[PDB]
Every structure is written in structure tokens, then in C-alpha cells.
């Protein structure tokens, strides 16, 4: 398929959802930039509807010099149990 | 936000959904490749759940030398009225 079409399933571990996002983006991409930009992007666009919803505030915002994935996984760092379903109505909105 | 976070709304015209997808990807990206790859990718990942669903068969497959968007818009070229809602159960699945 695409590289990055790999996406967070039922509360799939986020740093892992994106780690394979990057992995195969890396397998299919020779451009680190296109690799990152799509891992860091699909991290939202491809993530769980709640998890990208954890991400939308960070969406576009990355710390200067840091990885956006780090933050996007940090976004869903609260998603995976209980808080996932509390935030489901807030973030997924 | 991102560049490409612009996505097909309620049966939003697809070549147009992605044309702005590309536009702002172009505004925010200096790399034509990262521009294309994300327009051609978000063309699915960001498209309408039916329209990307029009795209999944083309997802990853582009004609040698052609734009994938051309095909992805062609995918939703049947989406926008009537067939959209027929295909809604098939493609969105």
C-alpha cells in the first residue's frame, strides 16, 4: 500500500503505531524528511480518531529540535485505558 | 496546523480537497517530494472516509509517471452524489 497506511487499531500502543509508521515509511522512503514528515503527520491523520484527537493541539506544533512523534505518542500516552474513554468524548469529539 | 490537515468535509469536491491539500503542503513544504507524497497520501488518509475508501485500491498504486492524486480524485470522481451513498456501505465499509 502506502508506507504509512499502518495505523492505530483498537487503542493500539501509540509510540508503536507510529514506530511501524516510521519503520515502513523508512523502508519505502529514501528521504528522511519525507519519512519524518509522514510519520509525524500520519501520527495524527492515521492515528486513532481519539489519539489524533489527542494530537490536534500538537498537530503542527513540535518543540524546536524535537520529534513530533515523541509528543504525539505523548498525546496518546494518556490513551489506552480509562482516560482513553474519558477523552473519547472530548478529543475524538 | 500541519500543512495537509485540510481534509474532505461532507462530500467535499475531491480534486479540490486535495488541491488545497497540495497547496498548503506546498506553502509549508520546500520539498516537492514531501509535498507530493503527503498530498498523494493525505489524499487517502485525510480524505473522506468514503473517498479514501474509494482510494484504498489505488492506495500505494500510481501509474508510472502519473500523479496519484489524479487517480485518487478519480476514485472520488464517483463520490459526491448518489454513488457516494451507494459506495458508502461498500468502500467506507
Chain A residues with CB under 8 Å of B42 CB are 41, 45
Q: How many domains does chain B fold into? A: 1
| Residue environment code for A28-58, b if the CB has 16+ CB neighbours within 10 A, otherwise e | bbeeeebbbbbbbbbbbbbbbebbbbbbbeb
Chain A residues with CB under 8 Å of B44 CB are 2, 5
Chain B residues with CB under 8 Å of A45 CB are 2, 4-5, 7, 42, 45-46
DSSP for residue A42: H
* Separation CA B21–CA A83 (nearest Å): 32
* Separation CA A5–CA B60 (nearest Å): 9
Q: Give me the DSSP letters along A61-73.
A: ---TTS-HHHHHH
**Cβ <8 Å between B4 and A31:** no
C-alpha grid cell for residue B60? 500505494
Taking each continuous run of H as one helix and of E as one strand, the counts in chain B are 5, 0
Q: At what angle do helices B32-45 and A32-45 cross, to 10 degrees?
A: 20
Residues B50 and B91: beta-carbon distance below 8 Å: yes
Residues B4 and A40: beta-carbon distance below 8 Å: no
C-alpha grid cell for residue A7? 495505523
* Separation CA A9–CA B15 (nearest Å): 28
**Cβ <8 Å between B2 and A59:** yes
Q: Give me the DSSP letters along B48-72.
A: -TTTHHHHTTTTT---TTS-HHHHH
Exp. method: NMR
What kind and span of H or E run contains B28?
A: helix B14-28
Q: B16 to chain A, minimum CA–CA distance in Å?
A: 18
* A15, A84, A50, A86 alpha-carbon torsion, rounded to 10°: -160
Residues B69 and B90: beta-carbon distance below 8 Å: no
Residues A45 and B44: beta-carbon distance below 8 Å: no
* Separation CA A12–CA B80 (nearest Å): 32
Question: What SS3 state is found at B7?
Answer: coil
Range of the domain at B77: 1-93
Best CA proximity match to A47, nearest among A86, A80, A84, A14: A14
Query: Which of A2, A7, A31 is nearest residue B34 as measured by Cβ atoms?
Result: A31
Rg of chain B in Å (alpha carbons) = 12
Amino acid at each position: 500500500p502506502s508506507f504509512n497506511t499502518v495505523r492505530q487499531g483498537s487503542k493500539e500502543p501509540y509510540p508503536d503505531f507510529v514506530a511501524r509508521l516510521q519503520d515502513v515509511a523508512q523502508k519505502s522512503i529514501a528521504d528522511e524528511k519525507a519519512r519524518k514528515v509522514i510519520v509525524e503527520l500520519m501520527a495524527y491523520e492515521n492515528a486513532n480518531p481519539e489519539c489524533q484527537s489527542a494530537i490536534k493541539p500538537l498537530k503542527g506544533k513540535v518543540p524546536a529540535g524535537s520529534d513530533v512523534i515523541s509528543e504525539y505518542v505523548k498525546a496518546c500516552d494518556g490513551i489506552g485505558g480509562a482516560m482513553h474513554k474519558a477523552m473519547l468524548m472530548a478529543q475524538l469529539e
